[PDB]
């Protein structure tokens, strides 16, 4: 092959991958003050029932 | 042919027994019929689809 090749480039390849944004989730919840206390005949235990 | 017949050792054979449950010994103050408690039911988390 000819003597010129020399100056014919030559590029590495390339392989990617992109991924982009992810999940916000949330969850929630919504505790009682009056509801809550016509059950729990103790309030101790409404305590422990928050945490 | 005659003495009263002469008795000499009775023992009262006796053993103990036991539970393989004492472990599980929870005492109490013996108050109220009915007694209860609870769990609570799961809330898997949601996509947040903020539109």
Same mark, same amino acid.
């Given at each position: 092959?000819?003597?010129? %090749?020399?100056?014919? +480039?030559?590029?590495?390849?390339?392989?990617?991958? %992109?991924? $982009? =944004? $992810?999940?916000?989730?949330?969850?929630?919840?919504?505790?009682?003050? =009056?509801?809550? +206390?016509? =059950?729990?005949?103790? %309030?101790?235990?409404?305590? =422990?029932?928050?945490? | 042919?005659?003495?009263?017949?002469?008795?000499?050792?009775?023992?009262?054979? @006796?053993?103990?027994?036991?539970?393989?449950?004492?472990?599980?010994?929870?005492? /109490?103050?013996?108050?109220? /019929?009915? #007694?209860?408690?609870?769990?609570?039911? @799961?809330?898997?988390?949601?996509?947040? @689809?903020? #539109?």
């Amino acid at each position: 092959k000819n003597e010129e %090749l020399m100056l014919k +480039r030559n590029y590495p390849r390339m392989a990617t991958k %992109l991924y $982009g =944004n $992810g999940i916000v989730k949330k969850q929630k919840f919504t505790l009682n003050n =009056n509801d809550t +206390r016509f =059950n729990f005949q103790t %309030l101790a235990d409404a305590t =422990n029932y928050a945490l | 042919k005659y003495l009263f017949p002469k008795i000499n050792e009775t023992l009262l054979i @006796d053993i103990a027994l036991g539970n393989r449950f004492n472990w599980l010994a929870k005492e /109490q103050d013996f108050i109220g /019929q009915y #007694s209860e408690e609870y769990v609570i039911m @799961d809330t898997v988390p949601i996509n947040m @689809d903020l #539109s």
